[PDB]
Write a protein that binds this ligand. Structure first.
Ligand SMILES: [K+]
Ligand SMILES: [K+]
Ligand SMILES: [K+]
Ligand SMILES: [K+]
Ligand SMILES: [K+]
Ligand SMILES: [K+]
Ligand SMILES: [K+]
Ligand SMILES: [K+]
Ligand SMILES: [K+]
Ligand SMILES: [K+]
Ligand SMILES: [K+]
Ligand SMILES: [K+]
Ligand SMILES: [Mg+2]
Ligand SMILES: [Mg+2]
Ligand SMILES: [Mg+2]
Ligand SMILES: [Mg+2]
Ligand SMILES: [Mg+2]
Ligand SMILES: [Mg+2]
Ligand SMILES: [Mg+2]
Ligand SMILES: [Mg+2]
Ligand SMILES: [Mg+2]
Ligand SMILES: [Mg+2]
Ligand SMILES: [Mg+2]
Ligand SMILES: [Mg+2]
Ligand SMILES: [Mg+2]
Ligand SMILES: [Mg+2]
Ligand SMILES: [Mg+2]
Ligand SMILES: [Mg+2]
Ligand SMILES: [Mg+2]
Ligand SMILES: [Mg+2]
Ligand SMILES: [Mg+2]
Ligand SMILES: [Mg+2]
Ligand SMILES: [Mg+2]
Ligand SMILES: [Mg+2]
Ligand SMILES: [Mg+2]
Ligand SMILES: [Mg+2]
Ligand SMILES: [Mg+2]
Ligand SMILES: [Mg+2]
Lengths: 202, 209, 102, 53
RNA sequence: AAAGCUCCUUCGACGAGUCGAGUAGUUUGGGAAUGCUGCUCAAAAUGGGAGGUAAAUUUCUUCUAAAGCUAAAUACCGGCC
RNA sequence: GUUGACCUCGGAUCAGGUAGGAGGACCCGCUGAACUUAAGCAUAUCAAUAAGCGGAGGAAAAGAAACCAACAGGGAUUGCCCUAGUAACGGCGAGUGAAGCGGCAACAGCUCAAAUUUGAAAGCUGGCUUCGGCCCGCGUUGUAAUUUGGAGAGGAUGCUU
C-alpha cells in the first residue's frame, strides 16, 4: 500500500519537502473563512486511522483558533478578594485548543455527530484543525453495525461533555497510581470520600 | 479550648457535612429485591446452574500467601491440557481468563484435574432433539440428581494447610549445623555484603595481572 | 527454570520452593523487533526527505573531531541523555557510510 | 454490461454440467488503484508505470 | 460453500507537533515537583512507559500509549402511581 | 476552431430530511467567591463548595491494563465493609488526608488503521417499477470478504460442525 509511506513521511516535519508544503498551505488557509468546509481530507492517512470512510454521510470541516493563553475577564484588573487569586495574566485554560475547535464546528453543523479531529498546521497566531463528522439520519449510516452505534440518543453532542479522544485526555481517564483522583470522575470521587454513612445497627 | 486531661480531638466536621449523609432505612427492603431477582434468574436458566466454574488461586503478598481462594477464570494452557476448545468453554458454564499465566507446575496440575472432574459430571442436551450428535448425552443418562450452585459443589476444600500432625520418635530430623538462629543471622549478613565482596575480588584479580 | 529458591525468608534467593517452568513468549512481547517491510520503507523515506537542521549541526561537530560538544548539544535538543547517545551513534553511522562508499 | 453477459455464459455452462474456466479465458487488462499498483512495483511485476502530474 | 482441533522450517505490517524534556500557572496526601493546560525544543525499534528521593554505569520485573463499542450490582421522591 | 471532460466555488419557494424551547432532584464538563477558623492577619481554611455557562438519560458516567505488585504471584469497570484518622501534606500552626492487598453484592465480552479480490468493486444512497428488476449516481485519493497480538498469515494432516 501507499499509506504506509505517508505515515513515515509525516514524521519528518523539519525536512525540506515537508516545510515547503506546510508554508504554502498555511497561507492558503487564513485567506478563507475562520470556519469552512473541505472537499476532501488533506491528510488521507491520518483521517483513515481515526475512523474516516469514503462514503456518503462522512464530511470534513476546517477551523482555526486564536492560539494563546486565557486572560481573566474583569473590569480593568480588579478582583475584589484575597491576594492569592488576584492574578490576571499568566493563567491557563483547562481544556485544549483542539477541544474549542470541535465545539465551534458542532454548533455550525447541528444535525451531525462529531467523531474526531486532528492537527494540520499552525503559526504564530493560529492553529488549524480538521474535524470528522457523521450524518446520523442518512440511510447508508444507519445500515452499518460498525458505525450505527452513534445514532442512539446517548451520543448527542459528545464534544460538549468530553467523550471524544481529546476530552478523555483532559479529564484524566487512565489506570494506575498516578490518576488516583480522576480515574472514575473527579467530582464523583470527591463526593464518595466526603459522605457520612450511618447504618441501622451502629 | 481544653480544660482537663483529654485526648486531643480531631473531628472532621468543618465542611457542610449535613448535605451528604446517607442513612440506610432500606436495608431490609433491598434484601427482598435481591432475592426476587435471584429467584427469577434461576428460573430462566432452567436446568443449568446459576453460576460459572472458577479455578483455584493463591493470594499475592507475604501476608496472605498461605491461603487459597477462587479466581477469575481458567488459563488457555489449562484448557488445552484438559482438551476443551476455547470457543466451546464459555457456552457450557466455564469462565475463561486470557491474561493469567502458569509459572509453576503446582497450580497447573491442580486446575487441570478440576476441569476433568467437571467434564465427567456434565450432561449435554442436543441442539435438535430428533437428531442427536455423537458428542451429546444419549438421553438414557439425562435423568439424574443435579446441582444448581457450583460455588458449594466446587468450592475451596481446604484453604489452609493442616496445623498439626504426628511422627514417630527417632524419625525427627536433625537441625541445621549451627542452629536456626545463627542461620538467619548469616543469611542476612551475606546479602548486605554481596557488593563489597564482589568489588574486592574484581580489583584483586585485575591488580594480579 | 532460572534458579531454585533456598526455602527460607531473608536470604539471597529466598522464598518457597516450587517447580518452575519455561513459557513460550506471548505475541505481545514482540513490540520492539524489526521487520523487512518497516526497514525497506524507512530507508526510502530517509533518502527522499533528507536531514533536519539540528541533525546537520551535529554531523559537522562529529566529523570535526569534537565529541563532548556533540553529545552536550544533542541532549539540549532531544531532552535526555539516553536519546542523545542513540542519535549520535546513528549519525556517526551515516558519516562512515557516506565517506566509505565513494 | 460485458460482465453481466460473461456471468450469464458461465451460469449456463454450470447448469449444462461443465464448470467455469471452460468458457472464459485468462484476461489481460491495465492495472490501477494506488495501493494495488504500489504493491506490484515492490514485487517487481510491473513493466511500465505512468504517473499523473 | 463455510467452520473448529493437532503439528511446523520460515514470516509476523501494530496509531507523531504524539511521547519525552525545560519553563510558567493552577491543583493534589504526592514530598528536587500527583494530574491538567499555555509557550520553546522535539524522538526511537527489542524500541517505549512504569517500578512514590535528584544523577551516571550495569542488570531485572511488568505491561503495550497517542483510534472505538458494551448489560448488572450504584445515585435520585424532580415526573406518574 | 468547435465540441467534450476534470477540479474548485455558487443559485434555486429544486426532491427528501434534521436542530433550537421546556425540564434540570440525580448525571458529564467549564468558570468561580467571600462571610467564617486561625482568639489579631497576608500562605492556609471554609472549598477544588454557593452563585454563572454549555450537554444527556431512566439511569448517566466508567470499563476489558502502556494496571497492581516484589508474592508459592494476582487479573476489565462500578458499589458496601475493612485498610485508616493510617503513609503523607501543613506560618509542621489552626487544620487536612488517599491507595495496593482481604470478605462480599453483581458478572460478559469485543472492532478498526497498518497486507494486491487483481482470474474480473465481489460493496452502497436515490428514482421508476408486476415485483422482476432497470436507470443514473457514490466510489480505485479505496466500498465488501479476510486479520487485531489472547494472536495471526502461509504450509501439512484427517476427523468433526
Ligand atoms: K471576589
Ligand atoms: K495562588
Ligand atoms: K487565602
Ligand atoms: K508542560
Ligand atoms: K522494559
Ligand atoms: K523509581
Ligand atoms: K449544486
Ligand atoms: K429532593
Ligand atoms: K447557574
Ligand atoms: K492493613
Ligand atoms: K459495483
Ligand atoms: K474491511
Ligand atoms: Mg461527497
Ligand atoms: Mg464510553
Ligand atoms: Mg482509556
Ligand atoms: Mg443485611
Ligand atoms: Mg519489548
Ligand atoms: Mg496501539
Ligand atoms: Mg481554576
Ligand atoms: Mg504542577
Ligand atoms: Mg423543497
Ligand atoms: Mg436547549
Ligand atoms: Mg457559616
Ligand atoms: Mg480570626
Ligand atoms: Mg474572634
Ligand atoms: Mg478582623
Ligand atoms: Mg451551581
Ligand atoms: Mg426523556
Ligand atoms: Mg441500574
Ligand atoms: Mg453509557
Ligand atoms: Mg487488549
Ligand atoms: Mg501477574
Ligand atoms: Mg479488578
Ligand atoms: Mg485501628
Ligand atoms: Mg479517619
Ligand atoms: Mg481540601
Ligand atoms: Mg478465519
Ligand atoms: Mg491456518
Amino acid at each position: 500500500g501507499a499509506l504506509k509511506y505517508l505515515e513515515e513521511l509525516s514524521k519528518k516535519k523539519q525536512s525540506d519537502v515537508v516545510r515547503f508544503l506546510l508554508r504554502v498551505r498555511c497561507w492558503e488557509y487564513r485567506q478563507l473563512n475562520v470556519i469552512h468546509r473541505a472537499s476532501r481530507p488533506s491528510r488521507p492517512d491520518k483521517a483513515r486511522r481515526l475512523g474516516y470512510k469514503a462514503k456518503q454521510g462522512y464530511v470534513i470541516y476546517r477551523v482555526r483558533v486564536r492560539r494563546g493563553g486565557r486572560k481573566r475577564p474583569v473590569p480593568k484588573g480588579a478582583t475584589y478578594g484575597k491576594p492569592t487569586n488576584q492574578g490576571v495574566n499568566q493563567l491557563k485554560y483547562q481544556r485544549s485548543l483542539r477541544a474549542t475547535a470541535e465545539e465551534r464546528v458542532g454548533r455550525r453543523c447541528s444535525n451531525l455527530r462529531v467523531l474526531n479531529s486532528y492537527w494540520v498546521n499552525q503559526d504564530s497566531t493560529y492553529k488549524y484543525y480538521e474535524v470528522i463528522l457523521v450524518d446520523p439520519n442518512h440511510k447508508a449510516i444507519r445500515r452499518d453495525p460498525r458505525i450505527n452505534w452513534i445514532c442512539n440518543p446517548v451520543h448527542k453532542h459528545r464534544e460538549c461533555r468530553g467523550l471524544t479522544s481529546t476530552g478523555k485526555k483532559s479529564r484524566g481517564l487512565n489506570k494506575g497510581h498516578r490518576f488516583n483522583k480522576t480515574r472514575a470522575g473527579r467530582r464523583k470521587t470527591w463526593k464518595r470520600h466526603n459522605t457520612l454513612s450511618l447504618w441501622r445497627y451502629r | 479550648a481544653i480544660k482537663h486531661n483529654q485526648q486531643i480531638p480531631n473531628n472532621h466536621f468543618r465542611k457542610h457535612w449535613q448535605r451528604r449523609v446517607r442513612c440506610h432505612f432500606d436495608q431490609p427492603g433491598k434484601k427482598v429485591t435481591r432475592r426476587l431477582a435471584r429467584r427469577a434468574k434461576a428460573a430462566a436458566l432452567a436446568p443449568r446452574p446459576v453460576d460459572k466454574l472458577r479455578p483455584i488461586v493463591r493470594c499475592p503478598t507475604v501476608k496472605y500467601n498461605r491461603r487459597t481462594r477462587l479466581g477469575r477464570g481458567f488459563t488457555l494452557e489449562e484448557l488445552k491440557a484438559a482438551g476443551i476448545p476455547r470457543l466451546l468453554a464459555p457456552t457450557i458454564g466455564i469462565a475463561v481468563d486470557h491474561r493469567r499465566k502458569n509459572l509453576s507446575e503446582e497450580s497447573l496440575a491442580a486446575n487441570v484435574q478440576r476441569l476433568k472432574d467437571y467434564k465427567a459430571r456434565l450432561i449435554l442436551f442436543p441442539r435438535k432433539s430428533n437428531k442427536p450428535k455423537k458428542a451429546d448425552t444419549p438421553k438414557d443418562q439425562q435423568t439424574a440428581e443435579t446441582t444448581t450452585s457450583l460455588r458449594t459443589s466446587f468450592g475451596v476444600e481446604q484453604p489452609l494447610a493442616p496445623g498439626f500432625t504426628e511422627i514417630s520418635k527417632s524419625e525427627i530430623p536433625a537441625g541445621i549445623e549451627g542452629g536456626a538462629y545463627r542461620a538467619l543471622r548469616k543469611a542476612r549478613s551475606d546479602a548486605r555484603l554481596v557488593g563489597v565482596r564482589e568489588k574486592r575480588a574484581k580489583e584483586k584479580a585485575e591488580a594480579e595481572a | 527454570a532460572p534458579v531454585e529458591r533456598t526455602g527460607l525468608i531473608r536470604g539471597l534467593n529466598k522464598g518457597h520452593k516450587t517447580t518452575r517452568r519455561v513459557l513460550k513468549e506471548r505475541p505481545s512481547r514482540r513490540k520492539g523487533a524489526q521487520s523487512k517491510r518497516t526497514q525497506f520503507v524507512r530507508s526510502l523515506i530517509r533518502e527522499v526527505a533528507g536531514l533536519a537542521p539540528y541533525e546537520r549541526r551535529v554531523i559537522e561537530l562529529l566529523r570535526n573531531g569534537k565529541d563532548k560538544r556533540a553529545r552536550k548539544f544533542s541532549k539540549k535538543k532531544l531532552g535526555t541523555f539516553g536519546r542523545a547517545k542513540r542519535k549520535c551513534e546513528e549519525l556517526q553511522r551515516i558519516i562512515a557510510e557516506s565517506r566509505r562508499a565513494h | 454490461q460485458e460482465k453481466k453477459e460473461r456471468l450469464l455464459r458461465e451460469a449456463t455452462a454450470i447448469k449444462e454440467g461443465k464448470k467455469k474456466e471452460d468458457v472464459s479465458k485468462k484476461p489481460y487488462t491495465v492495472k490501477y488503484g494506488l495501493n494495488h499498483v504500489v504493491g506490484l512495483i515492490e514485487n517487481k511485476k510491473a513493466s511500465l508505470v505512468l504517473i499523473a502530474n
